[PDB]
Amino acid sequence: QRIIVNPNEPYLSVIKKVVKLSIPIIVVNLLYTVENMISMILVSSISPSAVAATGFSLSLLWFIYSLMALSYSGTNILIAQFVGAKKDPSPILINGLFLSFLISLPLFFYGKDFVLFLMKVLGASETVRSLAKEYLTPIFWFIPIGFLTNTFYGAYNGAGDTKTPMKVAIIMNLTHIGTAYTLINLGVEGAGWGIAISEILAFFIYTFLLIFFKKPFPLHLRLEPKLLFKMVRLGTPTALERAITTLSFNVFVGFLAKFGDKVLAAHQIGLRIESISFMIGFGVMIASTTLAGQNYGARNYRGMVHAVNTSAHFTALVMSLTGLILILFPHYLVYPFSRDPEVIEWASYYLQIVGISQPAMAYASIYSGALKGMGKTHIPLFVNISSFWLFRIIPSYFLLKVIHSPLVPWGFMTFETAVRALFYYTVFKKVVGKLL
């Protein structure tokens, strides 16, 4: 019944309430890694052309799944503020559910023919097109169901119940792995039905315990169609932030593409080791959005700032240990990917450089999440994109023309995540000041 943080809550009591929100969210994202990694093992069982049709379609789903951030943010942030304000959050759910159902319609029928038409700028023949169509025919069949499940995740996370979406995720992963492995060995369509069936089951779940059980709230009868204007206004900066950043990664990765085909491999190898250390900060970002959102809606700003200050220092300590393990044991972490010793050379240089900025990378997530919970979704859009260019790409684009070294993009990457962190603890200090 709403997790408020009192302004003098002991440090120990605050953190033990952050991990109760973060750990279930982290498990959902850790299972997402296993769900996709096992999916790669199931598609690489027949022809290698099915591996190419999947990896290029999954990355094409990354740019496409940015529309989910529109309905997620509007649902997750407004529910958190309402629950904190001791208010009925019933209209926000089925307005976001209705909102997610609408934005998914342009991807219905029309979105299906957008990837096949796009598969003519890489050399994709009629065979790669036909195979990639089998995999995406059931996926694009049931997109509104995937958009409705994503709104239930935001509704659960906003209300403070992140355990139950983890339970459904544990069922969703086994269902996807179970359905795919069974139907794959009958065409690559089986892996596509695993996504479709794991989404209908999660939705059939997310529909059953609404009508029959708890859910974030006991539903009711919505009477407020004017709230989706604020859900669209809230979700718009978050949807653009995730989309523009993914476009900015390809530009930054392009800086390392000029260094042969070994630095690109070493960058991806460190990226996987970075991703394991990234599931934490993203989970603590969503947990901070819930905590800051409910305390903001409760008008308990004294404790809202105390909760985010406590979780900022603690996660910085956790990432400090994470940064220490990365710097101390670089070669140990690359052994599963240790093919060429020269690749290990750049991989060890990468992890040691980015390991310095792991604590700073925690302040960005804890403050972005806090600011998103306060309804300031435009701030992470402005902060994460401005700094990404005039502090990463722009300094690297000029210094690479003189000082040719692949650790120039990696050095400016660590330097910028530390400047972005010092940017957040300033806006937040400013927003809190006017808040008091």
Added chain:
Amino acid sequence: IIVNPNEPYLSVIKKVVKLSIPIIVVNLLYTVENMISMILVSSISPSAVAATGFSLSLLWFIYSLMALSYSGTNILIAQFVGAKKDPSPILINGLFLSFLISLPLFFYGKDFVLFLMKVLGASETVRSLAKEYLTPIFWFIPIGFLTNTFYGAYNGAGDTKTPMKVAIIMNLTHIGTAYTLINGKFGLPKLGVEGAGWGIAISEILAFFIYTFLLIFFKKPFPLHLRLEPKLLFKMVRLGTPTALERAITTLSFNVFVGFLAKFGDKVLAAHQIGLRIESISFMIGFGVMIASTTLAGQNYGARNYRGMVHAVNTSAHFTALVMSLTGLILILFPHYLVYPFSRDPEVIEWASYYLQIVGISQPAMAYASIYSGALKGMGKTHIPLFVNISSFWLFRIIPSYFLLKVIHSPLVPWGFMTFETAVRALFYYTVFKKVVGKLL
């Protein structure tokens, strides 16, 4: 620039044409400048016309980022002028913000010829011709964003005459520079399609200098003032973010609507472009009254004079709708006369006539959309035109046309669902605006 709530009808619409007509002249000159630019490029080869016309349609998509700096500058200056506050921090921040967003386009923005151009069916020479045409254009994109922000600063302050004077200078410079370089007038070498690009680039560097010269030596729309306040960057970005997404998604949304008419041969697609240009000349009117409404509603909203703000937009709505009643009637009564400059196949005249006879009925409602989309922009609700002009588009234009065309094949189905959608969209606005006005009082 302040309308009293009991002000006579004439006294408010006089101030409307004072703002709208200079913007209309700006918009009409750009439409006439585009026609003249095609003729200079058509003097080379039809391959150069394809490389130019394809790059321009991409520039329509690319130049959506200008809405980020324009909305932040145009809207906040209008409110600051109404609120009797110094608008200098908004101009210096808009110029700085427009210069920042233009940087990613300055580097990798040019490299879309070997991507978006080459993929969508560009010949072996159309790609190479579009390269040297966009090389000078993308050399001074930051200057293009700086000029555009000055247009928002002028329109926000209520001085739309001076940007018209610069636009008249900008068009003759562009046409003069292109005509001189396309064929080497003064014994100069013929630069080809590159000259068409230098006309755009040189016209921007001159329009920027004229604006800059007026800023320093004539204490301009407002004297630029020392103390900066980089803080409103967030407010300007938050205000410009929905508008930039609106124009960008609309272009991708508009291409979905043309696909419906692509399944009816090349004569319906030709009559659609014919009916578009004829109606687009009537589009530049509503765009000027929209920008004028953003200024008028924006300034009166900043002065806290709400009852007068509602009286000005209602009067502007009921006047533009009368103009679009005359404009719409000319489309109904004289179709073949407007299509005659483009009338080639007698069946193309037949399809273009049914288009103008359908969209001409939705011209008054089209005026209510612009006058209300602009009124809400000036109030700061830039998210409302985003949700209205997109949700109404799919729910009442694309999807109804998608279903009815699967059972009845006729070009009058998406055209009829057009007019029907741009009338249940104007009614979408007047409701929101009436609800937002009530809570504002």
